[PDB]
Amino acid sequence: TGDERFYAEHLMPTLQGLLDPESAHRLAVRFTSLGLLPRARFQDSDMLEVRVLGHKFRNPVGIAAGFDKHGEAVDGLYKMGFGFVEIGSVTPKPQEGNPRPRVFRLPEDQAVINRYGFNSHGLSVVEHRLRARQQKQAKLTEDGLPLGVNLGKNKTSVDAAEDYAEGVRVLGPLADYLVVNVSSPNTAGLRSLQGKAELRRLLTKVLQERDGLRRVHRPAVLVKIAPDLTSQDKEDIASVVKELGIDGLIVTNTTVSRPAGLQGALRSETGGLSGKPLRDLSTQTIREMYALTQGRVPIIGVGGVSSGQDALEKIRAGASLVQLYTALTFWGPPVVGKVKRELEALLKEQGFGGVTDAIGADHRR
Ligand SMILES: COC(=O)/C(C#N)=C1\SCC(=O)N1c1ccc(C(=O)Nc2ccc(C(C)(C)C)cc2)cc1
Numbered sequence: 491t492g493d494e495r496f497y498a499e500h501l502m503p504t505l506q507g508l509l510d511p512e513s514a515h516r517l518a519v520r521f522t523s524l525g526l527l528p529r530a531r532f533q534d535s536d537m538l539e540v541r542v543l544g545h546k547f548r549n550p551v552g553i554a555a556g557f558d559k560h561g562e563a564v565d566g567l568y569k570m571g572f573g574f575v576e577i578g579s580v581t582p583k584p585q586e587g588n589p590r591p592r593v594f595r596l597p598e599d600q601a602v603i604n605r606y607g608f609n610s611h612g613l614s615v616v617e618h619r620l621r622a623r624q625q626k627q628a629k630l631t632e633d634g635l636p637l638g639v640n641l642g643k644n645k646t647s648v649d650a651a652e653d654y655a656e657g658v659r660v661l662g663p664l665a666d667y668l669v670v671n672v673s674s675p676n677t678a679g680l681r682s683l684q685g686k687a688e689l690r691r692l693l694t695k696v697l698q699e700r701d702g703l704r705r706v707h708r709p710a711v712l713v714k715i716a717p718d719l720t721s722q723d724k725e726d727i728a729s730v731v732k733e734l735g736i737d738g739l740i741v742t743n744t745t746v747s748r749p750a751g752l753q754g755a756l757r758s759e760t761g762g763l764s765g766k767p768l769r770d771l772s773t774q775t776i777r778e779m780y781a782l783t784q785g786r787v788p789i790i791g792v793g794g795v796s797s798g799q800d801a802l803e804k805i806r807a808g809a810s811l812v813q814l815y816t817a818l819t820f821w822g823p824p825v826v827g828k829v830k831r832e833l834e835a836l837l838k839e840q841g842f843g844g845v846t847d848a849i850g851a852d853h854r855r
Pocket residue numbers: 505511512514515517518519521522526527528593595602815816818819822823
């Protein structure tokens with residue numbers, strides 16, 4: 491479209507040039523929360539609907555965690571055309587996160603590096619924010635627009651599992667799904683929660699807390715993993731997920747790797763790398779987890795999606811749904827409709843009746 495070109499070729503390069511990436515993020519959150527967004531001209535077709543996690547999703551393209559950390563822009567994000575919204579990560583207590591600067595744009599790589607460190611308004615603030623629009627959300631959910639909440643842990647916590655359990659109790663009742671994010675690269679020790687008898691201990695506690703919520707307030711629980719896992723870690727996670735009946739996986743978080751070939755001047759900043767360089771690392775991790783789980787565990791695929799092709803690759807690899815984030819700094823909001831339009835076109839071109847028919851299609855080749 492005309493908006494797609496104007497945003498990618500003019501508005502975003504201008505914004506990028508005037509504002510550092512953190513400031514641009516904050517402005518984006520404000521604009522979105524006010525609905526100051528281009529028209530989402532795209533009308534979701536029936537072919538894009540997916541049923542998974544105990545819900546209808548009008549389209550399979552969601553906003554990944556980290557854009558709306560504190561639940562300030564949820565309605566705006568639906569207005570953008572996302573089929574689902576995930577907020578967070580939210581930590582139990584408020585916390586500032588790392589010192590500034592902590593977000594870096596790598597334009598030559600279509601990538602970003604961030605070390606936010608779980609900056610969060612905390613559970614109580616977010617709880618109240620979601621409660622103010624709880625019924626508005628229940629209507630959205632019923633209409634195929636669900637809400638996920640991603641739960642973190644505070645930097646100085648002495649009991650990680652207890653942080654997550656607090657999150658389940660406070661925000662679980664307000665969410666269609668919860669995410670245990672045990673994959674931020676930017677909280678010391680966090681990704682060690684991805685190992686075995688200990689991941690099983692953590693997840694058992696989170697599920698117990700979830701199962702204690704009243705039925706209408708009982709979310710699905712997903713685990714979000716990194717793209718930097720060993721084969722051993724992957725196998726272990728798949729094992730535990732099956733054993734405990736975790737509802738789904740989010741694959742992947744950002745990478746602590748630095749693929750060969752990055753050009754940006756800021757490539758050696760500490761933090762998680764997102765965007766194009768993560769893309770195929772993420773697709774491959776979807777592929778592997780789909781096979782380890784025998785296609786029985788729904789996957790939300792995320793990392794470097796900026797086109798329909800990138801979305802379809804993840805779906806065919808085993809994702810039921812996809813998310814994006816970093817593409818917005820390069821393309822802006824029009825990327826959402828672009829992705830959806832392109833995905834629909836490809837699905838038709840490859841002889842799929844809808845998204846659902848494409849899920850895991852590469853494993854049946
Ligand atoms: C002066 O600013 C504007 O005009 C904005 C904004 N601001 C406008 S006019 C209509 C509109 O749609 N906008 C907008 C632009 C970009 C984003 C965005 O999502 N930006 C964005 C910024 C940074 C990142 C990271 C670097 C954190 C990944 C991601 C997205 C969202 C909204």
